[PDB]
């Protein structure tokens, strides 16, 4: 008899912070200390096994400075002699779309303006524009950091004394960020 | 690699159910587990086959038999109940240092 449990299954962590992933096992079942080994295997060597925790019945893996590419599902595995078990752990890395750069371009001869919002973050954001009657065009690329750069462009005749807000929705994080553009 | 067949299996309550876990290359150093996905989609160990012996985790109805072709295994549930219905999979790892887990696709049991 031998099983592994996971006290916490989903770890939501910000880029740049630390995380310690854990799965546990009952040392009254796995009595033989010499035959204990543990591994964290991504479903697809950043996490360090804290092996002094194994005699305590804990497989603990530390990532001291989290990156976007640490996100995903992992199998937290313990072998106890000639038996083994595992649990799935999910790391959800967040890089908030907190810095939203804005741009205003006047279009000659139309009385219209082209408004841009651009921000980087993770996972992919969708962009809406508040209380406007014209559709926006939004695109993205991925950066080498694994962030998405999301760019949204709206062209309209600004109703005099109106501001315009672009909203970034980061669904996995249930996060909204926004910028307000004053075309004056 | 591992397969786990049939991908969809239906039996009447009280009948035995048998899945086959087929390994591309079984060897004596492997430990073979039979798992179920829980109501939270977490893997939960049902039984293991290691050193030629099947050991159930919490229900002795679950047993693993190595076939004469060595590389295939029957995962048998004796005397099925409605609540045995669900998604199961098999998984293997070597006892050798640095070994990687391999998992089969899931297979669904429906008990009627």
UniProtKB/Swiss-Prot annotation, chain A:
UniProt topological domain (Extracellular) ranges: 1-184
Tissue: Expressed in immature and mature bone marrow-derived dendritic cells and splenic dendritic cells. Highly expressed in placenta, liver and weakly expressed in heart, spleen, lymph nodes and thymus. Also expressed in some tumor cell lines of lymphoid origin.
Record annotation: effect of changing residue 39 to Y: No effect on PDCD1 binding
All residue ranges annotated as the Ig-like V-type domain in the record: 2-92
Keywords: Adaptive immunity, Cell membrane, Disulfide bond, Glycoprotein, Immunity, Immunoglobulin domain, Membrane, Receptor, Repeat, Signal, Transmembrane, Transmembrane helix
Keyword Cell membrane recorded: yes
Result of changing residue 79 to A: Abolishes the binding to PDCD1
Effect annotated for changing residue 37 to S: Significantly reduces the binding to PDCD1
Glycan attachment sites: 131, 137, 163
Record note on quaternary structure: Interacts with PDCD1.
Name of the protein in question: Programmed cell death 1 ligand 2
Gene: Pdcd1lg2
From-to range in the entire protein, with total length: 20 to 210 of 247
Swiss-Prot record, chain B:
Claim: Cell membrane is one of the keywords in the record: yes
Cellular localisation: Cell membrane
Molecular function as annotated in GO: signaling receptor activity
Main location: membrane
Keywords for the protein's UniProt record, in alphabetical order: Adaptive immunity, Apoptosis, Cell membrane, Disulfide bond, Glycoprotein, Immunity, Immunoglobulin domain, Isopeptide bond, Membrane, Phosphoprotein, Signal, Transmembrane, Transmembrane helix, Ubl conjugation
Ranges facing Extracellular side: 1-112
Annotated tissue distribution: Thymus-specific.
Cystines in this chain: 21-90
Description of post-translational modifications: Ubiquitinated via 'Lys-48'-linked polyubiquitin chains. Deubiquitinated and thus stabilized by USP5.
GO cellular component, one term: external side of plasma membrane
Keyword Transmembrane helix: yes
Limits of the Ig-like V-type domain: 1-106
Ranges where the record places region Interaction with CD274/PDCD1L1: 37-44
Phenotype when the gene is knocked out: Mice grow and develop normally but exhibit splenomegaly, selective augmentation of IgG3 antibody response to a T-independent type II antigen, and enhanced proliferative responses of B-cells and myeloid cells by anti-IgM and granulocyte colony-stimulating factor stimulation. Mice are prone to development of autoimmune diseases. In a C57BL/6J background, mice spontaneously develop lupus-like autoimmune phenotypes, characterized by proliferative arthritis and glomerulonephritis with predominant IgG3 deposition.
Sugar-modified residues: 16, 25, 41, 83
Top-level taxon of the source organism: Eukaryota
Subunit text: Monomer. Interacts with CD274/PDCD1L1. Interacts with CD273/PDCD1LG2. Interacts with FBXO38; leading to ubiquitination and degradation by the proteasome.
Chain's role: Inhibitory receptor on antigen activated T-cells that plays a critical role in induction and maintenance of immune tolerance to self. Delivers inhibitory signals upon binding to ligands, such as CD274/PDCD1L1 and CD273/PDCD1LG2. Following T-cell receptor (TCR) engagement, PDCD1 associates with CD3-TCR in the immunological synapse and directly inhibits T-cell activation.
Protein's name according to its UniProt entry: Programmed cell death protein 1
Organism expressing this protein natively: Mus musculus
């Amino acid at each position: 008899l031998f099983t592994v449990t996971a006290p916490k299954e989903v770890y939501t962590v910000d880029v740049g912070s630390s995380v310690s992933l854990e799965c546990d096992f009952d040392r009254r079942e796995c009595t033989e200390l010499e035959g204990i080994r543990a591994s964290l295997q991504k479903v697809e060597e950043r996490a360090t096994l804290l092996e002094e925790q194994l005699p305590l019945g804990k497989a603990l893996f530390h990532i001291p400075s989290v990156q976007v590419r640490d996100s995903g599902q992992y199998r937290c595995l313990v072998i106890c002699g000639a038996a083994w078990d595992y649990k799935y752990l999910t790391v959800k890395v967040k890089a908030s779309y907190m810095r939203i750069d804005t741009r205003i371009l006047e279009v000659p001869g139309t009385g219209e303006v082209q408004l841009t919002c651009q921000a980087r973050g993770y996972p992919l954001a969708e962009v809406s524009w508040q209380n406007v009657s014209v559709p926006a065009n939004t695109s993205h690329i991925r950066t080498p950091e694994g962030l998405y750069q999301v760019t949204s462009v709206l062209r309209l005749k600004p109703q005099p004394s109106r501001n315009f807000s672009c909203m970034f929705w980061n669904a996995h994080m249930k996060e909204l960020t926004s910028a307000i553009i004053d075309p004056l | 690699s591992l397969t786990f067949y049939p991908a969809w299996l239906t039996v009447s309550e009280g009948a035995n159910a048998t899945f086959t876990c087929s390994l591309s290359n079984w060897s004596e150093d492997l430990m073979l587990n039979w798992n179920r996905l829980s109501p939270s989609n977490q893997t939960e160990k049902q039984a293991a086959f290691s050193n030629g012996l099947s050991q159930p985790v919490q229900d002795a109805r679950f047993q693993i038999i190595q076939l004469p072709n060595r590389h295939d295994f029957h995962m048998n549930i004796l005397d099925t109940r409605r609540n045995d219905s669900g998604i199961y999979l098999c998984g293997a790892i070597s006892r050798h240092p640095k070994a990687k887990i391999e998992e089969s696709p899931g297979a669904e049991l429906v008990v009627t």
